[PDB]
Amino acid sequence: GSHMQALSYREAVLRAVDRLNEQSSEANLYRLLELDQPPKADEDPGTPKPVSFTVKETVCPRPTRQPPELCDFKENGRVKQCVGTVTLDQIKDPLDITCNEVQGV
């Protein structure tokens, strides 16, 4: 009801965005600069949710022991639009997202 159970679409994107920072072997982390509102979002538990967002370079190296949102943000950092599909009513989420840069950066 109030706590427990994740079902807000952003919860799945927050986990995927944090996983992208951990799975990537880059020098600086990439916090989500902006999230998009794709089709089929928070209205289908059995089916995965096609997410889409733009990520920018932050001021923290890969090994930070925390998510990119916990750190600041580099305005002169490049941004990339990483998009993938993930379920909102289940765990075990593999890495199936593709990035195609962000128009306007």
Swiss-Prot record:
Disulfide bonds: 60-71, 82-99
Coiled-coil annotated spans: none
Pro-sequence residue ranges: 5-105
Annotated spans, Disordered: 36-55
Source species, domain of life: Eukaryota
Keywords of the record: Amidation, Antibiotic, Antimicrobial, Disulfide bond, Secreted, Signal
GO MF: lipopolysaccharide binding
Localisation: Secreted
GO cellular component: extracellular space
GO-annotated biological processes: antimicrobial humoral immune response mediated by antimicrobial peptide; defense response to Gram-negative bacterium; defense response to Gram-positive bacterium; innate immune response
Function: Microbicidal activity.
Family (UniProt): Belongs to the cathelicidin family.
Protein name, UniProt field: Protegrin-4
Name of the gene: NPG4
Full-sequence portion shown in this chain: 30 to 130 of 149
